[model samples]
Target: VINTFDGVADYLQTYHKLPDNYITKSEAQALGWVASKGNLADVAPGKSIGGDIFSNREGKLPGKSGRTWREADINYTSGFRNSDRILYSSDWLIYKTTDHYQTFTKIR
Candidate 1:
């Protein structure tokens, strides 16, 4: 399992299994995730991360038409979510950021 942003982002590039800490938004929501509250551990112990569509609304990431992107949080441990995250697409394109979505660096 990965605990660092770099490790997780790099791993996402190739054919690899998801880190145990990564969970889809729907999966976390079902376990009582309140985005505004960040109360996750109480409902589901060890479940503090979520992933969902990245949208790439600003067109900052390179992509062709019809390409969809997904994002996952890094090192989430409850309370307010951190700014760190990993954004990736189906083609194994992976990017990592520490300042939220303001900037991204391709890791894989």
Candidate 2:
């Protein structure tokens, strides 16, 4: 998967698989994003997939020495987005959820 928002969306929209390269809230903030208003474009040229660290404390996903998980909202709009999200790891792991982080389905 690619790290950019459009890259992942393109892959997912074209192929039946999810891509990688999700951005963290901190990373988006660096680009001048404010969660309160969801004004990512104000800083980022395109609507970026600003995400947050997702700790696998539930142990649902496999544990690896260097694996790190992150999450990005799916179908994000200007205002508050839905709970649906795509979770991914730096090592090419991917998952999806519709009900927030309550559950997930492995995509890659």
Candidate 3:
């Protein structure tokens, strides 16, 4: 059903049958939502994007969609994880869950 990643663009690309080359219209459109995953400060390599803003501090939801994806505080919260120190590095993908973030459904 809708609960599964089978239909969602993020799950498809993130998991099996992953993209090999470039972005699709669906992928580009999903960026607004998908990019929200991982740490915000981790977005850029050298400098922070919008400052150590995540969750309430972020002034907006950290990631594009789900609350679980937002690693707002690395120092305080244990929910969010930091894969790499590099901002632009895509090495980080949320494989965990947190209580601070309420679960969200995709925009169907």
TM-scores of the models, in the given order?
A: 0.82, 0.61, 0.17
Q: Which model is ahead, 1 or 3, in terms of lDDT?
A: 1
- Expressed as tens digits, the lDDT of each residue in 1-108 for candidate 3 is 211222323433355222232222243334432344643223322221111213334333334343332222112211223332111102233222233334422321
Off by over 4 Å in 3: 1-89, 101-108
Residue 45, candidate 2: C-alpha displacement in angstroms: 6.3
Q: Which stretches of candidate 1 lie over 4 Å from their true place?
A: none
Q: Residue 26 deviation, candidate 3, in Å?
A: 20
Sorted by TM-score, highest first, which candidate order results? 1, 2, 3
Off by over 4 Å in 2: 1-23, 30-32, 41-45
Best by lDDT: 1
Error of 1 at 90 (Å): 1.3
**Model 1 RMSD vs true structure:** 2.0
TM-score comparison, 1 vs 3, better candidate: 1
What lDDT would candidate 3 get against the real structure? 0.27
**lDDT of candidate 1 over 1-108, digit per residue (tens):** 475767776666654545677778788788778878877766666664645788888888898867778888788776777898888787778788889899988887
Q: How many backbone clashes does candidate 2 have?
A: 3
Q: How does each model score on lDDT?
A: 0.75, 0.65, 0.27
